[PDB]
Amino acid sequence: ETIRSQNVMAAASIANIVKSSLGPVGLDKMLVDDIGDVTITNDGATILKLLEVEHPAAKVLCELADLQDKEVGDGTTSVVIIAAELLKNADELVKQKIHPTSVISGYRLACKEAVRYINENLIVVPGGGAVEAALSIYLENYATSMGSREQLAIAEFARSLLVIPNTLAVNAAQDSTDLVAKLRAFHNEAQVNPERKNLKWIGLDLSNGKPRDNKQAGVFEPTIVKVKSLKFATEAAITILRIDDLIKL
């Protein structure tokens, strides 16, 4: 084993800690103190400023999450999730002889061509899981029309952005694969069929188990939160990718 998979595992651990309290309806966590004073809370914005993280990669992830939180006071528990999913998929890539730099260039290209398409989803962003499931398909199409050593790091940036819609549906007791795949089947006929271009607002519903139009239902999210989250999760994944050794003094 190498110390890149260890950083990936640390980021994945802090993710799995935070990712079950994401949506509006999400279970709580208990943070046992030193004396034992327990605080039961969702809203990972606090679970990240109270968690005892000792690993350096988890530490950097917490630092960039808090930086995002103080830049804009929203979308700090999704940054950690997207970053850890980027790290998981980037480790799977590197483990088949894809240099971390090619993956980093791919993530840069993807995060730069995703905010240049979110400006075709803006009005605020539909929210829910709409922008994620739309960027998934758009980037999976934009990757293949490039064909460079980084054509595989944009298709693992597109299948790893649907971790928000895929964890917004296990925190709603509905499903993981079925609901997200109905979401990613409505957004397909919004980039393939020009008539049904209004199917790009169809996010998912957390009350009932069926995707609805999150423009005719007012579940918007400010564009500067989604853009900042994609732009900070990308930097977090990149920062934890560009390390490859731990020097002991």
Binding site: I17, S20, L27, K29, M30, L31, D33, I40
Partner: protein, 249 residues
């Protein structure tokens, strides 16, 4: 759920089982063994709870909740750790069938709103009083079991489970008199399916069924409401705790 909403039910089960028999007029003493010499016998639930170091955060929360209820209402403080160990014991049978904690919490919190509708209905003025013994619990249980015949949903089994969980109070008022908890509880169920027999309870000293409009046991409908509210709230405050993580502050 996972091994965290089943490691919070075993703490609740443990706390309930420690005091379960310290309930009724026919209480049964317990022995508290100190480090040096030990034995001090007391049939008082609170002291037993205020003197055992549990060290588990779930148990620490059940003890905390019980102390608060005791220093708020006084009576009905050992009927709160019970109905919270019992209502959790029945929750585990659904967390084993891959039923999200959100669904049982959406069933518990739904049974409560119907739990406090018959206490308002079976009460008698001069606020109001509610039939003591097991009559109030069996009446609420039968009411919920009749309201759960038109649910047509997946949150229908957790609804009946709560109903049949408000029988540990008669189940212990019968077990402390030496009678058979089965042959007598079935008779209580039979009595409660009739029209006017909503006050039939258990004579806590003889172990026989007596109409509480003739034995004269009545509990104020403010220690039977705070008891049920606090029970079904400690049953949804320990079911929505997905992780017990470290905390530094």
């Amino acid at each position: 759920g996972r091994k965290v909403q089943s490691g919070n039910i075993n703490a609740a089960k443990t706390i309930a089982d420690i005091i379960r028999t310290c309930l009724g007029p026919k209480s049964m003493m317990k022995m508290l063994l100190d480090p040096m010499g030990g034995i001090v016998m007391t049939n008082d639930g609170n002291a037993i709870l205020r003197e055992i170091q549990v060290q588990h955060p779930a148990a620490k929360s059940m003890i905390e909740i019980s102390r608060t209820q005791d220093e708020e209402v006084g009576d009905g403080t050992t009927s709160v750790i019970i109905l919270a160990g019992e209502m959790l014991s029945v929750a585990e049978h659904f967390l084993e069938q891959q039923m999200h904690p959100t669904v049982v919490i959406s069933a518990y919190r739904k049974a409560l709103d119907d739990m406090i509708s018959t206490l308002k209905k079976i009460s008698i003025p001069v606020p109001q009083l509610v039939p003591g013994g097991g009559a109030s619990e069996m009446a609420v249980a039968h009411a919920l079991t009749e309201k759960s015949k038109a649910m047509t949903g997946v949150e229908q089994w957790p609804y009946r489970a709560v109903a049949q969980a408000l029988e540990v109070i008669p189940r212990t008022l019968i077990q402390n008199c030496g009678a058979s908890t089965i042959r007598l509880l079935t008779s209580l169920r039979a009595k409660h399916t009739q029209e006017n027999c909503e006050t039939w309870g258990v004579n806590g000293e003889t172990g026989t069924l007596v109409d509480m409009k003739e034995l004269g046991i009545w509990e104020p409908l403010a220690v039977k409401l705070q008891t049920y509210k606090t029970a079904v709230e400690t049953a949804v405050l320990l079911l929505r705790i997905d992780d017990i993580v470290s905390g530094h502050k």
